[PDB]
Protein backbone atom coordinates (compact mmCIF):
# COMPACT_ATOMS: atom_id res chain seq x y z
CA UNK A 1 0.00 0.00 0.00
CA UNK A 2 3.01 2.27 0.57
CA UNK A 3 4.80 1.63 -2.71
CA UNK A 4 3.88 0.94 -6.31
CA UNK A 5 5.65 -1.46 -8.65
CA UNK A 6 6.50 0.30 -11.91
CA UNK A 7 9.27 0.69 -14.49
CA UNK A 8 11.88 3.39 -13.73
CA UNK A 9 13.27 5.76 -16.37
CA UNK A 10 16.09 8.32 -16.15
CA UNK A 11 14.86 11.86 -15.46
CA UNK A 12 14.62 13.93 -18.62
CA UNK A 13 13.80 17.15 -16.73
CA UNK A 14 16.22 17.69 -13.85
CA UNK A 15 14.22 20.24 -11.82
CA UNK A 16 10.64 20.16 -10.51
CA UNK A 17 9.04 23.61 -10.35
CA UNK A 18 12.32 25.14 -9.20
CA UNK A 19 13.22 22.34 -6.77
CA UNK A 20 16.25 20.12 -7.34
CA UNK A 21 15.75 16.37 -7.57
CA UNK A 22 18.44 14.44 -5.65
CA UNK A 23 17.86 11.20 -7.55
CA UNK A 24 18.37 9.79 -11.05
CA UNK A 25 15.17 7.90 -11.96
CA UNK A 26 11.43 8.53 -11.98
CA UNK A 27 8.05 7.19 -13.16
CA UNK A 28 4.86 8.79 -14.48
CA UNK A 29 2.61 6.16 -12.86
CA UNK A 30 1.24 8.36 -10.03
CA UNK A 31 0.23 11.23 -12.35
CA UNK A 32 -2.82 9.71 -13.99
CA UNK A 33 -3.17 12.72 -16.30
CA UNK A 34 0.32 12.10 -17.76
CA UNK A 35 1.73 9.27 -19.88
CA UNK A 36 5.20 10.71 -20.64
CA UNK A 37 7.78 13.01 -19.03
CA UNK A 38 7.08 15.57 -21.76
CA UNK A 39 3.40 15.51 -20.84
CA UNK A 40 4.34 15.75 -17.13
CA UNK A 41 6.23 18.95 -17.91
CA UNK A 42 3.24 20.39 -19.76
CA UNK A 43 0.83 19.59 -16.90
CA UNK A 44 3.23 21.09 -14.34
CA UNK A 45 3.36 24.17 -16.59
CA UNK A 46 -0.42 24.51 -16.19
CA UNK A 47 -0.16 24.07 -12.41
CA UNK A 48 2.48 26.83 -12.38
CA UNK A 49 -0.33 29.38 -12.66
CA UNK A 50 -0.55 28.92 -8.89
CA UNK A 51 2.80 30.74 -8.52
CA UNK A 52 0.59 33.84 -8.38
CA UNK A 53 -0.92 32.48 -5.14
CA UNK A 54 2.17 32.03 -2.93
CA UNK A 55 0.46 30.53 0.14
CA UNK A 56 -0.95 27.78 -2.08
CA UNK A 57 2.26 27.50 -4.12
CA UNK A 58 4.33 26.89 -0.98
CA UNK A 59 1.98 24.08 0.11
CA UNK A 60 1.26 22.46 -3.24
CA UNK A 61 4.82 22.34 -4.72
CA UNK A 62 5.95 19.35 -2.66
CA UNK A 63 2.68 17.54 -3.39
CA UNK A 64 2.96 18.05 -7.16
CA UNK A 65 6.58 16.99 -7.20
CA UNK A 66 5.85 13.84 -5.16
CA UNK A 67 3.10 12.88 -7.61
CA UNK A 68 4.43 14.06 -10.98
CA UNK A 69 8.18 13.51 -10.55
CA UNK A 70 8.60 10.83 -7.84
CA UNK A 71 11.80 8.98 -7.04
CA UNK A 72 11.83 5.56 -8.65
CA UNK A 73 14.30 2.92 -7.44
CA UNK A 74 14.48 -0.84 -7.93
CA UNK A 75 11.28 -0.82 -9.96
CA UNK A 76 9.22 0.91 -7.25
CA UNK A 77 7.96 4.39 -6.38
CA UNK A 78 6.86 5.53 -2.92
CA UNK A 79 3.37 6.96 -2.70
CA UNK A 80 2.96 10.45 -1.21
CA UNK A 81 1.61 10.55 2.36
CA UNK A 82 -1.92 11.34 3.55
CA UNK A 83 -0.38 14.12 5.62
CA UNK A 84 1.30 15.83 2.67
CA UNK A 85 -1.96 15.85 0.72
CA UNK A 86 -3.97 17.22 3.65
CA UNK A 87 -1.65 20.24 4.02
CA UNK A 88 -2.85 21.52 0.64
CA UNK A 89 -6.62 21.45 1.11
CA UNK A 90 -7.09 24.83 2.82
CA UNK A 91 -4.44 27.09 1.26
CA UNK A 92 -5.28 25.68 -2.18
CA UNK A 93 -9.08 25.75 -1.78
CA UNK A 94 -9.21 27.89 -4.94
CA UNK A 95 -8.33 24.74 -6.94
CA UNK A 96 -11.52 23.02 -5.75
CA UNK A 97 -13.65 26.05 -6.60
CA UNK A 98 -12.08 26.78 -10.00
CA UNK A 99 -12.33 23.28 -11.44
CA UNK A 100 -11.89 20.57 -8.82
CA UNK A 101 -9.02 18.36 -7.70
CA UNK A 102 -8.30 15.48 -10.07
CA UNK A 103 -9.04 12.14 -8.40
CA UNK A 104 -5.33 11.23 -8.10
CA UNK A 105 -4.86 14.47 -6.08
CA UNK A 106 -7.76 13.91 -3.66
CA UNK A 107 -6.67 12.73 -0.21
CA UNK A 108 -8.18 9.26 -0.35
CA UNK A 109 -5.87 6.66 1.19
CA UNK A 110 -5.52 4.57 -1.95
CA UNK A 111 -3.57 7.47 -3.48
CA UNK A 112 -2.24 8.94 -0.22
CA UNK A 113 -1.81 6.16 2.38
CA UNK A 114 -1.30 6.55 6.12
CA UNK A 115 1.51 5.30 8.34
CA UNK A 116 4.23 4.74 5.73
CA UNK A 117 7.88 5.62 6.46
C1 LIG B 1 -5.80 33.54 -8.24
C2 LIG B 1 -5.14 32.72 -9.33
C3 LIG B 1 -3.63 32.95 -9.35
C4 LIG B 1 -5.45 31.24 -9.13
C5 LIG B 1 -5.07 30.47 -10.39
C6 LIG B 1 -5.39 28.98 -10.22
C7 LIG B 1 -5.33 28.23 -11.54
C8 LIG B 1 -3.95 28.48 -12.14
O9 LIG B 1 -6.33 28.82 -12.41
C10 LIG B 1 -5.64 26.74 -11.26
C11 LIG B 1 -7.08 26.52 -10.74
C12 LIG B 1 -7.49 25.09 -11.13
C13 LIG B 1 -6.19 24.52 -11.69
C14 LIG B 1 -6.31 23.25 -12.52
C15 LIG B 1 -6.86 22.14 -11.65
C16 LIG B 1 -6.76 20.80 -12.37
C17 LIG B 1 -5.94 20.59 -13.43
C18 LIG B 1 -5.99 19.24 -14.10
C19 LIG B 1 -4.58 18.70 -14.26
O20 LIG B 1 -4.62 17.47 -14.99
C21 LIG B 1 -3.73 19.73 -15.02
C22 LIG B 1 -3.63 21.03 -14.22
C23 LIG B 1 -5.01 21.65 -13.98
C24 LIG B 1 -5.60 22.11 -15.31
C25 LIG B 1 -4.93 22.81 -13.01
C26 LIG B 1 -4.14 23.97 -13.63
C27 LIG B 1 -4.07 25.20 -12.72
C28 LIG B 1 -5.48 25.68 -12.36
C29 LIG B 1 -6.22 26.11 -13.62
CATH (domain of 72): 1.10.2000.10
Which experimental approach was used here?
A: X-ray
Terminal-to-terminal C-alpha distance of the chain:
12
Closest of 106, 105, 80, 68 to residue 2, by C-alpha: 80
**DSSP per residue, 36-85:** SHHHHHHHHHHHGGGGGSHHHHHHHHHHHHHHHS--EETTEEEPPPHHHH
Cβ neighbour number for residue 64 with a 10 Å cutoff: 23
Q: How far is the CA of 45 from the centre of ligand 1 (A)?
A: 10
Residue 38 marked in a binding site: yes
Pocket test for ligand 1, best of 41, 44, 49 (most atoms within 8 A of CB): 49
* Residues 74 and 80: beta-carbon distance below 8 Å: no
How many Å apart are CA 42 and CA 59, to the nearest integer? 20
Domain count within the chain: 1
Q: Which domain holds residue 63?
A: 1-117
Binding-site residues, ligand 1, Cβ < 6 A:
33, 43, 46-47, 49-50, 52-53, 94-95, 98-99, 102
Amino acid sequence: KCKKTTTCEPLKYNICLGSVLPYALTSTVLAEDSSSQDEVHDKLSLWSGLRNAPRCWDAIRPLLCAVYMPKCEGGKVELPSQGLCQTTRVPCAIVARERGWPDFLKCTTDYFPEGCP
